[PDB]
Amino acid sequence: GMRFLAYFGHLNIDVLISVDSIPREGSVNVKDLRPRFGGTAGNFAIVAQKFRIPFDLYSAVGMKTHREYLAMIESMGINTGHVEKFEDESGPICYIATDGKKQVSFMHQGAMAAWAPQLADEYEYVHFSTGPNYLDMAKSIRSKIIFDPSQEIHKYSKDELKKFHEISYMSIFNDHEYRVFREMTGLSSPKVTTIVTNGERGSSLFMDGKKYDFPAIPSSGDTVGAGDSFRAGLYLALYNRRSIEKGMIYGTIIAHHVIDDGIENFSLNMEDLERETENYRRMF
Amino acid sequence: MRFLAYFGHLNIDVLISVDSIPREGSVNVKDLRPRFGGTAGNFAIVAQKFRIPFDLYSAVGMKTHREYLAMIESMGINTGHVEKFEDESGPICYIATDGKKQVSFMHQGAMAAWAPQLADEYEYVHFSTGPNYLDMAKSIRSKIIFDPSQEIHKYSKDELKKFHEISYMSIFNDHEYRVFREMTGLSSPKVTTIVTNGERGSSLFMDGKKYDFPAIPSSGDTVGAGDSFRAGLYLALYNRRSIEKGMIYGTIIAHHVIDDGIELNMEDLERETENYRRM
Incomplete structure (x- = not known):
């Protein structure tokens, strides 16, 4: 049977090293050290799971570093069956x-550079974000x-970028990446x-030769993963x-609540979301 | 009474290799690997190869040090006096x-939360790196x-003089002796x-005299050379x-670890020691 969504991205661990001064050379004492579990796949998965959106997460992790991250998302009910687990990689x-x-x-791809992705089953939507050899998979499938x-x-050449864009049902960029594109x-x-997302200012939708603007709802908090919250609202x-x-409106509203509340303490019923969405629509 | 209590670090070095360290922004990591070391660790590994009975005193954060503990435990090193902080790294x-x-980027972590207490009586107590060990040193009767x-x-002028005066022996490298x-x-x-001085060997200051012990020409990994020397001393x-x-035992054991690699018979050491004495 055909499934809804296959989502390709990183299950990245950021090791945040806080110091008084980063030296040119030599040692410095670490004032604070903590990990942050994220990446393109992770942040999406965590938010999308909270809305019970069905998806198969496709990624590659190194078991020298990613055992706790896997345990965390699995405890949230997220299936890691399509996440390749490299025992001797980080x-x-x-x-x-x-x-x-x-x-x-200092970015170590590790497992993500070692991965040869293979699309298991058939999906209605396939979201290709960060990672290796996606255009080869993209070309061969009939999914949106x-x-x-x-x-x-x-990392993509001119022809690879035009090809991947033209075969896509939709392309997504931030303001800078769209200029590069x-x-x-x-x-x-x-x-x-x-x-085309534009952080604190909102986002734009290029469709039918017209540009539709979606101003951001005023927010104050942790903006890490706001794009992934937005993508979860889209799906x-x-x-x-x-x-x-x-x-676009769902993404705007969900991004706003996750920034302000944090994903841990964030709930939102579909009745509020729908009412807030029609309000937004009438106002712009 | 036990032979030795050895205080130091069970340090994990996360070696991040890049083509160029940027002033700001990101850089791709070519190679990433851990190196298990530190003063307590490098000593413990070499000392265990000679079956020297020691009690390793340290503090590790379980967020990062589980595979290190696994390694030293598989070598037969008891980790009973290594404090295990579940929340720390x-x-x-x-x-x-x-x-x-x-x-x-040095993160003490568990070592910054450690309040060492010396359990048993020991003949020798070796205070290397870690918390201000002077409060412990003052109270004990050990060598x-x-x-x-x-x-x-980190020690003040008076703390350095005190710790030194109460010690049975003091040990330094050339730079630390200048600082001292x-x-x-x-x-x-x-x-x-x-006073150790790498490739140039070491010196023993005893009875108002300086006894020089030139190193045995070596080529290989110098990481832990000083700790191998200490294992030979003990x-x-x-x-x-x-x-x-x-001093000779230390010079020979250090040399063998550099050349032959960490991963020697007592009769072989006694003869090599005798051959060192005669140039």
């Missing part, structure tokens, strides 16, 4: 040294493909329906067979 | 390297070996003192040999 893991006035990130390259926009490809406007709409406008 | 050092340059190492700077003399204002030692002390014997 990663994806990023060591982030910070003083406030500077930041240095969402192209979401994020920080990996630079247009520039790398030579496309002035999108060939397919395209979402909530798609799952319920709602309009893309509805999906 | 560390001691752990994140070392970013590009060949030309290096940056270290104290003061080995401040990279933490020489400048902070305390002492031109020469007050108690028997060993091998002679365990077998009731003289200090001169310990």
Whole structure:
């Protein structure tokens, strides 16, 4: 039987290393050390799971570093059957040294660089975010493909970018990545329906040769994973067979609540979401 | 009464290899691997190969040190006096390297939450790196070996002089001995003192004399060379040999670990020791 969504991304661990001053060379004392479990797949999964959106998470992790992350998401009821587990690898893991006035990130792909993804079953939607060899999978399947390259926009050639975009049902970018895309490809406007997020300011939808703007709801809190909350709202709409406008609004409202409340203490009933969505729609 | 209580770090070095360490932003990690080390760890590994009876005193955070404990336990090293903090991580050092340059981010973690208590009576107590061990040292009647190492700077002028005066022996590398003399204002030692100087060997300051022990020409991994030397020193002390014997034992064991690798018969050591004496 055909499933709803296969979602491809990273289950990244950020090791946050807080120091007074990052030196040029030599040692410095770590004031605070803590991990943050995230990445493109992880942040989506955690929010999407809270809404009971069906999805098969596709990723690759190194068991030298990712045992606790796997245990956490599995405890939330998230199926890790399509997450490749490399016993003698570490990663994806990023060591982030910070003083406030500077930041240095040491990114170890590890397991994600070792992975040869294979699409198991047939899906209505396949979301390709960060990771290896996605265009080879994209080309061969008949699913509605969402192209979401994020920080990996630079690894694709001009023809790979135009190809992946043209075969996609929708492409998603942030403001910077859209400029890089247009520039790398030579496309002035999108060939397919395209979402361009713009952090605190909101997001835009390029569709039918027109640009529709979705202003952000004022928020105050942790913005880490706000894009993934937004994507979870989009899929909530798609799952319920709602309009893309509805999906943009759902994403906007959900991103806002997760920033303000935090995903742990965040609940939201569909009745509120729907009322808030029609209010938003009438106002703009 | 037990032979030795050895205080130090069970340090995990997270070696992060990159093509170039950036001023800001990200960089891809070419190679990522752990190295289990520290003063307590490197000593414990070598000392256990010679079956020297010691009680390792340390503090580790279970968030990061479970595979380290696993390794030393599989070598037969008892971790009964290694404090195990469930909520803490560390001691752990994140070392970013590009060949030309290096940056270290040291997290004491469990070592910063440790309040050491000395359980049994010991003949020898070796205080290397960790908390201010002077409060313990003051109270005990054991033969104290003061080995401040990279933490020489944390002790005040009076603390350095005190710890040194109460010690049976003090041990330093060349840099730490300079630091020691400048902070305390002492031109020469007050108690028997060993000063190591890598490839140039080591010196024993005893009875107002300096006895030089040139190193045995080696080529290999120098990580833990000083800790191997200390294991040879305690091998002679365990077998009731003289200090001169310990210096030679240390010079030979260090050399063998550099050349032959960590992963020696007592009769072989006794003959090699005799051959060292005759140049």
